[PDB]
Amino acid sequence: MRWKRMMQLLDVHCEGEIGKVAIGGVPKIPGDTVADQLHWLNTDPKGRELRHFLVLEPRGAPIGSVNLLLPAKDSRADAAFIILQPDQAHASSGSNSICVTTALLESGMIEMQEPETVVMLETAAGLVKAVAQCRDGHCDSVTLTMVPSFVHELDAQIATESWGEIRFDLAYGGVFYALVDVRQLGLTIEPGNARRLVEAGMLLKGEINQRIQVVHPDIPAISGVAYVMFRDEDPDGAVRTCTTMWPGRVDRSPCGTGNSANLATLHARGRVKPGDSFLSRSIIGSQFTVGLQGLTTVAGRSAVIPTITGRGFTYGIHQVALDDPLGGGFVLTDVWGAAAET
């Protein structure tokens, strides 16, 4: 007897970026803290197997994340979650935090109050406050208060064959970013350059992670440069972003965590102060509002408290049988990218 054990997922997107939210049938993930759960997912073969089942073919596709809803361990939190992608499990994500909030409210798992509901999400990076503007059972907007974000290294350099010396910032916005001014590559962040930006982003991610090891100073489970995010500024002042994601695709959203990491660099450079906000646009022109709420410190260095505002849209529901002659999960380089061959 099959279809005895089903996982139920709500299909949601935030400004174009898919965040499936697994709400029922999520297995127990070992670990005493959510950070330990993240570590286990990224180091235990059973966690890899679980992630691959959910995110590789035939159940998964190159675009989108699977958010595992997990029990809150912190009494202040309404729920916990970890983000699954084809590269690894990740601690944090703006677009996916909005998807989870949207899903929790629109499914009735959390009481929806109008005109505003506060949802406290627990991540491996810390608590993320999600303030939802609600109307008629609809979650219209969500503003996240992201985890304390900081600069790791400003103005780093790396030599490359195609562009010569590339300057970039290494910064933390819930995961670690290499932040790269795109004009250095002689490219603009526009749909026609998506393939070229992916190839550049992957080259850079691979090289940077070979040269330097980064870890959160208080949270050992968060390590490595997750993504290279290309950045520019539009004529009207908006921050244009293109987060590249292994094994080779771009974030459809303006990227919450990448904007948080970038905000830490803007503050370090004297270009923003608390109370400031601005727009960020993705490669497809979708938009977030990015705010600087205030300052804090992380392990002795200056840090920022970012806010990220965007909208989630529920577009369906999936039931996946957990209990096939392929089965495990597979990829091919045709749509997953050259790097997928690994």
Next chain:
Amino acid sequence: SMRWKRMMQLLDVHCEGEIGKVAIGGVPKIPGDTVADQLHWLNTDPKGRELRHFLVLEPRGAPIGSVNLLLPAKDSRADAAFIILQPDQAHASSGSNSICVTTALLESGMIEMQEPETVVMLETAAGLVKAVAQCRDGHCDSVTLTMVPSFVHELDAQIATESWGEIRFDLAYGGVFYALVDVRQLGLTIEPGNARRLVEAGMLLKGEINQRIQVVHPDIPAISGVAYVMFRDEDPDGAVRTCTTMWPGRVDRSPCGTGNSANLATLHARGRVKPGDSFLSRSIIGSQFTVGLQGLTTVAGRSAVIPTITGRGFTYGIHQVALDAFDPLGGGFVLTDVWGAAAETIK
């Protein structure tokens, strides 16, 4: 008006790794007096494109897989009808998707499952496809299709190319039209490491071949154009190795039923198979079909073959989609990063 539109229910199935979602609920009326007319409508009317894009482009759809639209049978001999939706167009035929549809109908109980065997007669725009399903303990373990009459359009065509010199290929029909290309001419083999190169080559050739020749089924005006370029080879053990390339740029994970059907028509024309023969075919990922030649017939007064294609389907989930009045991306979209360079032209 109403907040919610296009509420549809789909079974998630794959055949030897190739995804074929099957729409079993909320399917709207598709105009047309015949299934071929429905296919024409899907490929010509703005509302047909809207529906297809809704179902197959982001966020609801992804580069891999088809959506099979189950439709009311119009032929009284058929149990169900369907049309295949992909990011390039709607298509008349597909072996892997016929097996998905058969599997989904039986395993869901929408058609009563008989054991050890159930016969499901499927109507497509190309004609009736007999699906014989071996069924055991509530599961559809394998399906053998009797494909539509398949034939050669042109043998030994050639085309000049920058990278490969003169490429020899056959144009043939196996439910849709193929350009069939011996892969060794590219200096490549069909293996996962070459997937991206095969896609690029297949896309280049599809584009060039279609601007140079117009092909239409002689009895069915709605079936036109070269749908796919399928690279082919022969494994040491005699199996036919295939890699069907699909616009805007990916490979079939299955050995390809329609492509093997087209190829079978060329094998018969070259005197290399006779009725009763069968052989394996393998895809780029090593999944397998059994290909048989049942018999001979004619199309347009010229020789044609009746292929059989045997493979397995696997149901692995179910889902629902809807269209929220509030959603600004309800139309569907693509980006070249994972859909392919050619995706830039999808308006």
